Design a protein around this motif. Structure first.
Motif, PDB file in Angstrom:
ATOM      1  N   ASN A  40       0.819  -1.204   0.000  1.00 45.78           N
ATOM      2  CA  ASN A  40       0.000   0.000   0.000  1.00 45.78           C
ATOM      3  C   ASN A  40       0.857   1.261   0.000  1.00 45.78           C
ATOM      4  O   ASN A  40       0.499   2.260   0.626  1.00 45.78           O
ATOM      5  N   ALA A  41       1.990   1.219  -0.706  1.00 42.22           N
ATOM      6  CA  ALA A  41       2.987   2.279  -0.607  1.00 42.22           C
ATOM      7  C   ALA A  41       2.401   3.642  -0.954  1.00 42.22           C
ATOM      8  O   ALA A  41       2.444   4.570  -0.142  1.00 42.22           O
ATOM      9  N   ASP A  42       1.799   3.760  -2.141  1.00 38.17           N
ATOM     10  CA  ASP A  42       1.385   5.068  -2.644  1.00 38.17           C
ATOM     11  C   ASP A  42       0.420   5.755  -1.688  1.00 38.17           C
ATOM     12  O   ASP A  42       0.451   6.980  -1.535  1.00 38.17           O
ATOM     13  N   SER A  43      -0.448   4.979  -1.037  1.00 38.36           N
ATOM     14  CA  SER A  43      -1.358   5.559  -0.056  1.00 38.36           C
ATOM     15  C   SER A  43      -0.586   6.165   1.109  1.00 38.36           C
ATOM     16  O   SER A  43      -0.882   7.277   1.553  1.00 38.36           O
ATOM     17  N   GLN A  44       0.426   5.453   1.606  1.00 35.45           N
ATOM     18  CA  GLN A  44       1.177   5.968   2.745  1.00 35.45           C
ATOM     19  C   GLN A  44       1.981   7.209   2.379  1.00 35.45           C
ATOM     20  O   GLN A  44       2.140   8.101   3.218  1.00 35.45           O
ATOM     21  N   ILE A  45       2.481   7.297   1.143  1.00 37.09           N
ATOM     22  CA  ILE A  45       3.248   8.477   0.743  1.00 37.09           C
ATOM     23  C   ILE A  45       2.361   9.716   0.708  1.00 37.09           C
ATOM     24  O   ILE A  45       2.771  10.800   1.138  1.00 37.09           O
ATOM     25  N   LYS A  46       1.141   9.585   0.180  1.00 37.14           N
ATOM     26  CA  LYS A  46       0.285  10.760   0.032  1.00 37.14           C
ATOM     27  C   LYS A  46      -0.010  11.401   1.381  1.00 37.14           C
ATOM     28  O   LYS A  46       0.198  12.606   1.568  1.00 37.14           O
ATOM     29  N   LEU A  47      -0.485  10.608   2.342  1.00 33.39           N
ATOM     30  CA  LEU A  47      -0.719  11.147   3.676  1.00 33.39           C
ATOM     31  C   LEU A  47       0.593  11.461   4.387  1.00 33.39           C
ATOM     32  O   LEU A  47       0.621  12.303   5.292  1.00 33.39           O
ATOM     33  N   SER A  48       1.690  10.808   3.989  1.00 37.61           N
ATOM     34  CA  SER A  48       2.992  11.185   4.532  1.00 37.61           C
ATOM     35  C   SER A  48       3.300  12.638   4.223  1.00 37.61           C
ATOM     36  O   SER A  48       3.735  13.388   5.103  1.00 37.61           O
ATOM     37  N   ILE A  49       3.070  13.059   2.979  1.00 39.09           N
ATOM     38  CA  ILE A  49       3.164  14.476   2.651  1.00 39.09           C
ATOM     39  C   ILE A  49       2.141  15.262   3.456  1.00 39.09           C
ATOM     40  O   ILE A  49       2.438  16.335   3.993  1.00 39.09           O
ATOM     41  N   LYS A  50       0.923  14.728   3.563  1.00 45.34           N
ATOM     42  CA  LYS A  50      -0.150  15.447   4.241  1.00 45.34           C
ATOM     43  C   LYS A  50       0.197  15.709   5.700  1.00 45.34           C
ATOM     44  O   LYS A  50      -0.017  16.814   6.209  1.00 45.34           O
ATOM     45  N   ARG A  51       0.739  14.706   6.395  1.00 48.05           N
ATOM     46  CA  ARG A  51       1.166  14.945   7.770  1.00 48.05           C
ATOM     47  C   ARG A  51       2.462  15.745   7.809  1.00 48.05           C
ATOM     48  O   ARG A  51       2.688  16.528   8.739  1.00 48.05           O
ATOM     49  N   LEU A  52       3.325  15.561   6.809  1.00 47.06           N
ATOM     50  CA  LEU A  52       4.594  16.281   6.780  1.00 47.06           C
ATOM     51  C   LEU A  52       4.370  17.776   6.596  1.00 47.06           C
ATOM     52  O   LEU A  52       5.015  18.597   7.258  1.00 47.06           O
ATOM     53  N   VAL A  53       3.458  18.151   5.696  1.00 49.86           N
ATOM     54  CA  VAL A  53       3.190  19.570   5.487  1.00 49.86           C
ATOM     55  C   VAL A  53       2.521  20.181   6.712  1.00 49.86           C
ATOM     56  O   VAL A  53       2.712  21.369   6.999  1.00 49.86           O
ATOM     57  N   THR A  54       1.734  19.396   7.455  1.00 54.04           N
ATOM     58  CA  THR A  54       1.145  19.913   8.687  1.00 54.04           C
ATOM     59  C   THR A  54       2.206  20.187   9.743  1.00 54.04           C
ATOM     60  O   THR A  54       2.071  21.139  10.520  1.00 54.04           O
ATOM     61  N   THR A  55       3.262  19.373   9.791  1.00 50.98           N
ATOM     62  CA  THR A  55       4.379  19.660  10.683  1.00 50.98           C
ATOM     63  C   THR A  55       5.079  20.964  10.333  1.00 50.98           C
ATOM     64  O   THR A  55       5.795  21.510  11.180  1.00 50.98           O
ATOM     65  N   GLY A  56       4.896  21.468   9.113  1.00 53.27           N
ATOM     66  CA  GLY A  56       5.379  22.776   8.733  1.00 53.27           C
ATOM     67  C   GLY A  56       6.808  22.830   8.247  1.00 53.27           C
ATOM     68  O   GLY A  56       7.251  23.897   7.805  1.00 53.27           O
ATOM     69  N   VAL A  57       7.547  21.722   8.304  1.00 56.92           N
ATOM     70  CA  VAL A  57       8.957  21.773   7.934  1.00 56.92           C
ATOM     71  C   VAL A  57       9.114  21.790   6.418  1.00 56.92           C
ATOM     72  O   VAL A  57      10.181  22.135   5.900  1.00 56.92           O
ATOM     73  N   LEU A  58       8.067  21.425   5.683  1.00 56.88           N
ATOM     74  CA  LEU A  58       8.090  21.448   4.227  1.00 56.88           C
ATOM     75  C   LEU A  58       7.060  22.437   3.696  1.00 56.88           C
ATOM     76  O   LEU A  58       6.012  22.649   4.313  1.00 56.88           O
ATOM     77  N   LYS A  59       7.364  23.038   2.546  1.00 58.10           N
ATOM     78  CA  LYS A  59       6.534  24.073   1.942  1.00 58.10           C
ATOM     79  C   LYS A  59       5.959  23.589   0.619  1.00 58.10           C
ATOM     80  O   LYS A  59       6.704  23.143  -0.260  1.00 58.10           O
ATOM     81  N   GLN A  60       4.640  23.695   0.475  1.00 58.08           N
ATOM     82  CA  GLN A  60       3.974  23.428  -0.799  1.00 58.08           C
ATOM     83  C   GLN A  60       3.996  24.706  -1.626  1.00 58.08           C
ATOM     84  O   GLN A  60       3.239  25.644  -1.367  1.00 58.08           O
ATOM     85  N   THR A  61       4.867  24.747  -2.633  1.00 55.49           N
ATOM     86  CA  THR A  61       4.997  25.936  -3.466  1.00 55.49           C
ATOM     87  C   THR A  61       3.851  26.094  -4.456  1.00 55.49           C
ATOM     88  O   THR A  61       3.517  27.228  -4.819  1.00 55.49           O
ATOM     89  N   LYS A  62       3.251  24.994  -4.902  1.00 53.01           N
ATOM     90  CA  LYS A  62       2.177  25.045  -5.880  1.00 53.01           C
ATOM     91  C   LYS A  62       1.193  23.925  -5.584  1.00 53.01           C
ATOM     92  O   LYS A  62       1.559  22.901  -5.002  1.00 53.01           O
ATOM     93  N   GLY A  63      -0.060  24.127  -5.989  1.00 57.49           N
ATOM     94  CA  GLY A  63      -1.094  23.135  -5.776  1.00 57.49           C
ATOM     95  C   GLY A  63      -1.697  23.205  -4.385  1.00 57.49           C
ATOM     96  O   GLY A  63      -1.274  23.967  -3.515  1.00 57.49           O
TER      97      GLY A  63
END
Length: 74
Positions: A40-63
């Motif tokens: 189920n890799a792809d599912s875990q990556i998507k929410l991995s970004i989702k939780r990662l961006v909530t931690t604030g250490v990464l910036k979504q420049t577009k989208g």
DNA sequence: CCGTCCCCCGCGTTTTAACCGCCAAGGGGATTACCCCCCAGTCCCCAGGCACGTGCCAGATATATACATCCCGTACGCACGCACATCATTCGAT
């Protein structure tokens, strides 16, 4: 051979240093091609970004949400 | 909305095969003649089909019951990450 999702994600962005921010697919193709992740890799990556961006250490420049591009935001 | 590629696009060669111009032949399309044989025209006619009745049937029509199916929940596995203690590393003391 998969440690916590925090590590490869930041490593993947370091591999391709896009100043505009890495698009969602760029991480997705590489980390699965390079390392080995569960069925189920792809599912875990998507929410991995989702939780990662909530931690604030990464910036979504577009989208919005997971569909755009993300940046390490140093 | 985002992104992502690749696969059409212009553009430069360069090959050629259309396009031309001319020459020729004769098949055959177009035209004439003859006519016979063929379909329209009549009269008579007679039975095929149509208008009307008629019922019987089954075709329907309704009953009750069994079965097939779908969705949701349930459970249950599982592989998972998060969380955790432990193993192993690191800073301080030695």
């Amino acid at each position: 051979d998969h440690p916590k999702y925090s590590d490869m994600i930041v490593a993947a962005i370091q591999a391709e240093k896009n100043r505009a921010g890495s698009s969602r697919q760029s991480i997705q193709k590489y980390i699965k091609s390079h390392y080995k992740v569960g069925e189920n890799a792809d599912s875990q990556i998507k929410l991995s970004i989702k939780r990662l961006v909530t931690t604030g250490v990464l910036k979504q420049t577009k989208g919005v949400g997971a569909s755009g591009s993300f940046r390490l935001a140093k």
